[PDB]
Amino acid sequence: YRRGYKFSTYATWWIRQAITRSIADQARTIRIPVHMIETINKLNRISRQ
DNA sequence: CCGCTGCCGCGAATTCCGTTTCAGGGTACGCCTGATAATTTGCATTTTAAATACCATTTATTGGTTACT
């Protein structure tokens, strides 16, 4: 709290990180590593636009 | 105070054939670091123009002359 910021501002980053890291590790039968998941997500975001 | 309702379970033929093996989620980014998977040399075993060291039984040259168109 010494930083003087609202709690939610800090907490949201950790929550997003945890959720996304898990959805990368689990959720596939054959486990693609994290970095490849990031690259595939970039690929898909570029393809739509 | 031993009757009836209402829930929930469970089941519904046989072979072949055909066919599109097929798609859909809507969320970030940049560091250190060890952790494998690549790539680089030497040493065991073949295989060595062949070269080599002995046994082998079977023709070859043979030892030519004594009879004689």
Swiss-Prot record:
Cellular compartments annotated: Cytoplasm
Highest taxon above the source species: Bacteria
Family the UniProt entry places it in: Belongs to the sigma-70 factor family. RpoD/SigA subfamily.
Function: Sigma factors are initiation factors that promote the attachment of RNA polymerase to specific initiation sites and are then released. This sigma factor is the primary sigma factor during exponential growth. Preferentially transcribes genes associated with fast growth, such as ribosomal operons, other protein-synthesis related genes, rRNA- and tRNA-encoding genes and prfB.
Subunit (UniProt): Interacts transiently with the RNA polymerase catalytic core formed by RpoA, RpoB, RpoC and RpoZ (2 alpha, 1 beta, 1 beta' and 1 omega subunit) to form the RNA polymerase holoenzyme that can initiate transcription. Identified in a complex containing RpoD, the RNA polymerase subunits RpoA, RpoB and RpoZ, CRP and DNA. Interacts with Rsd; this prevents interaction with the RNA polymerase catalytic core and with promoter DNA, and as a consequence, promotes transcription from promoters that require alternative sigma factors. (Microbial infection) Interacts with Escherichia phage lambda antitermination protein Q.
Record comment regarding domains: Contains 4 domains, connected by flexible linkers. In the active conformation, the domains are in an extended conformation, each making extensive interactions with the RNA polymerase catalytic core.
Protein name stated in the entry: RNA polymerase sigma factor RpoD
Residues included from the entire protein: 421 to 469 of 613
